[PDB]
């Protein structure tokens, strides 16, 4: 009989609360059984008791590595159900902060993936840049990570009068940090022997198992939601989609690094093409009026009262809205019954399908290889468990 | 539009073969990594000397809550209960009644800081700028019961932090 | 950075690049922590006339979904859900990494 072992939840390589029950013959993995739900907080049932504005901060806590992306997905779904449109400046700000969030998420993923393998230093090198990006978050919103900045009508506040310059100064030095990380990892032979030909998944198996994002592009599938189904001013920016060849950990690492480079490219374009105007839909029955008008106008005060007590009513209907979050296709199936509260909100996270495919990906590998596969799948359990 | 990340092949000329052999037998890329780590050692660290140095913050930063007053000393809160209605975490408890002079004022205003998510929705909903999230973040306690604020604690927070709260609002209210 | 020139040369040689050009630490090139007040322009619907809300009401333009052959209620060439997706191009900027 094989030896049964508990990997996590109190394990540095478990990436949080995961109970991986493995059967081992020696150190060769015979079966992985992921036990999840150790971070199941009942987010969907809790959302069913909130207004559409009240339920927005839950999406920040879903994927606590990529926050503005969850906010953007939920806002897009609610905007689609409301039949309203965000202003152009709001959309450009949304895309800019989505790319900044992508940089944050890719730094997190790559550095902790290398930390699991044994490379501890790039984590420290890149978390200074992560700290500067949290400074950007805090300056625009007042919170370092849980901003609640993106709303279902646009954004909450406008950019402060020195933010764009500071984002530019940050952006022209980040490529050197990526280069130093690549000098540490890309051509290292230990890194390659740890990552090359580990967790190889075929394109058809990836398609049938429900993978998305890099997990697809590592296998050579040419699919990206920002290119095929754009949801913002993304159809006005120019960038390339990194595509893998071997479907292994090393190819996905290269893909994530090149996605960081393309995010820098998109950020430069967004900084150049920021338009003027308002930041939220000019419809006071969806977005709150400005505080001066609320304090001087009767209709503005009535609408402020009714928006912050009851909230806007969304017309009845169901939508499935998905975006290209840094970990893959992040989606929401939202069902509205015509009231100020969502009737149902199902949250689709790529980590669910990726962790379901972990057992398929770990066949014929060792314990360290399974650690590498868990790292390369880019799993955060706030969205897997919800 | 797309690019390939790992779809290149190496040359087969004897010079490149000898270069690869020398790389394999003499560990050139490992020396390059060693060089990179060495470069960092001579650089200035990013560490700040806390608590004698503090990280940068913004006027929009939202921390500990506070109830404010008018310049005459009258409480701004009019017991409208919009902050309680909007609170995502249901962390605000309010009870009100007419005062001795007929003023609309609260008798109970409690915020559960262990329930609160520090989203700032309450200060956006307030129509008189009574409840705010101050700049303070160094208010960690030793018991759970110390994080259950009542009206006296919040008014004391406002009286303690008003000088800075008013200055922060002065630099932010034109963005709201 | 206040590093000496010898140490600067040592770091530049060890890393193989020029470090002083792009420094991770922000010294004085950043924006001021005190800024002038903004003005924040108003939105399109701030008109005084010709601004009836019924002409700009997105929520009331929503309709129940259209019914395509409810069951309870000529060669006919076959169709796809959408035209076939167009093949991607290989990055005239940089095709290979």
């Amino acid at each position: 009989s094989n030896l049964t072992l508990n990997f996590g939840p109190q394990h540095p390589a478990a990436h949080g609360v995961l109970r991986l029950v493995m059967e081992l013959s020696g150190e060769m993995v015979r079966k992985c059984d992921p036990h999840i739900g150790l971070l199941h907080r009942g987010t969907e049932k809790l959302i069913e008791y909130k207004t559409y504005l009240q339920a927005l901060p839950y999406f920040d806590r879903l994927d606590y590595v990529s926050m503005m992306c969850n906010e953007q997905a939920y806002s897009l779904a609610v905007e689609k159900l409301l039949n309203i449109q965000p202003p152009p400046r709001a959309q450009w700000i949304r895309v800019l902060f989505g790319e900044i969030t992508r940089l944050l998420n890719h730094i997190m993923a790559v550095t902790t993936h290398a930390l699991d393998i044994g490379a501890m230093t790039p984590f420290f090198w890149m978390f200074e840049e992560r700290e500067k990006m949290f400074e950007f978050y805090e300056r625009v919103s007042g919170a370092r990570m849980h901003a609640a900045y993106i709303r279902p009508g646009g954004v909450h506040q406008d950019l402060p009068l020195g933010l764009l310059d500071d984002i530019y100064e940050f952006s022209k030095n980040f490529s050197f940090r990526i280069d130093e990380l690549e000098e540490m990892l890309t051509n290292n032979r230990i890194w390659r022997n740890r990552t090359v030909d580990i967790g190889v998944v075929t394109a058809e198996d990836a398609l049938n198992y429900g993978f998305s994002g890099v997990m697809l592009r590592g296998s050579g599938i040419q699919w990206d939601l920002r290119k095929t189904q754009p949801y913002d001013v993304y159809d006005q920016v120019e960038f390339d989609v990194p595509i893998g060849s071997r479907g292994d950990c090393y190819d996905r690492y290269l893909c994530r690094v090149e996605e960081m480079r393309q995010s820098l490219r998109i950020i430069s374009q967004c900084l150049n093409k920021m338009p003027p105007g308002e930041i939220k839909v000019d419809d006071a029955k969806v977005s709150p009026p400005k505080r001066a008008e609320m304090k001087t106008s009767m209709e503005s005060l009535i609408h402020h009262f009714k928006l912050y007590t009851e909230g806007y009513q969304v017309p009845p209907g169901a939508t499935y809205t998905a975006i290209e979050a840094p970990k893959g296709e992040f989606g929401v199936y939202l069902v509205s019954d015509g009231s100020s509260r969502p009737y149902r909100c199902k949250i689709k996270a790529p980590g669910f399908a990726h962790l379901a495919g972990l057992d398929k990906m770990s066949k014929g590998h060792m314990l360290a290889d399974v650690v590498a596969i868990i790292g390369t799948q880019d799993i955060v359990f706030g969205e897997v468990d919800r | 539009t797309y690019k390939f990340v790992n779809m290149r092949e190496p040359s087969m000329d004897m010079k490149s073969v000898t270069d690869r052999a020398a790389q394999t037998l003499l560990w050139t890329e490992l020396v390059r990594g060693l060089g990179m780590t060495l470069s960092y050692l001579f650089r200035e660290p990013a560490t700040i000397n806390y608590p004698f140095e503090k990280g940068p913050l913004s006027p929009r930063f939202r921390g500990e809550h506070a109830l404010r007053r008018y310049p005459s000393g009258e409480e701004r809160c009019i017991a409208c209960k919009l902050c309680e209605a909007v609170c995502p975490a249901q962390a605000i408890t309010i009870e009100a009644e007419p005062r001795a002079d007929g003023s609309r004022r609260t008798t109970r205003y409690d915020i559960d800081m262990t329930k609160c998510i520090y989203c700032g929705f309450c200060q956006e909903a307030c129509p008189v700028d009574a409840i705010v999230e101050g700049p303070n973040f160094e208010f960690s306690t030793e018991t759970h019961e110390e994080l259950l604020y009542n009206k006296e604690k919040l008014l004391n927070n406002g009286d303690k932090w008003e000088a800075e709260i008013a200055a922060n609002i002065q630099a932010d209210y034109l963005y709201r | 950075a206040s590093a000496t020139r010898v140490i600067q040369l040592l770091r530049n040689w060890a890393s193989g690049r020029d470090l002083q050009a792009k420094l991770q630490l922000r010294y004085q090139e950043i924006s001021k922590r005190t800024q002038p007040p903004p003005k924040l322009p108003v939105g399109p619907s701030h008109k005084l006339s010709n601004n009836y809300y019924c002409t700009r009401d997105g929520r009331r333009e929503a309709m129940p979904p259209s019914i395509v052959m409810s069951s309870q209620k000529t060669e006919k060439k076959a169709v796809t859900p959408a035209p076939p997706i167009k093949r991607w191009e290989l990055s005239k900027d940089q095709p290979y990494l």
């Binding site: 280069d179 890309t186 480079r261 430069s268 920021m274 | - | 690049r17």
Partner: peptide, 29 residues
């Protein structure tokens, strides 16, 4: 009758931002 003041890129634009990989030769034969 003051004009609109808002966070905008400067007239013209920002300077170019490098994003491509840069790993120098740094080797002997």
């Amino acid at each position: 009758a003051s004009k609109v003041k808002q966070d905008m890129p400067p007239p013209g634009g920002y300077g170019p931002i490098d994003y491509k990989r840069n790993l120098p030769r740094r080797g002997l034969s």
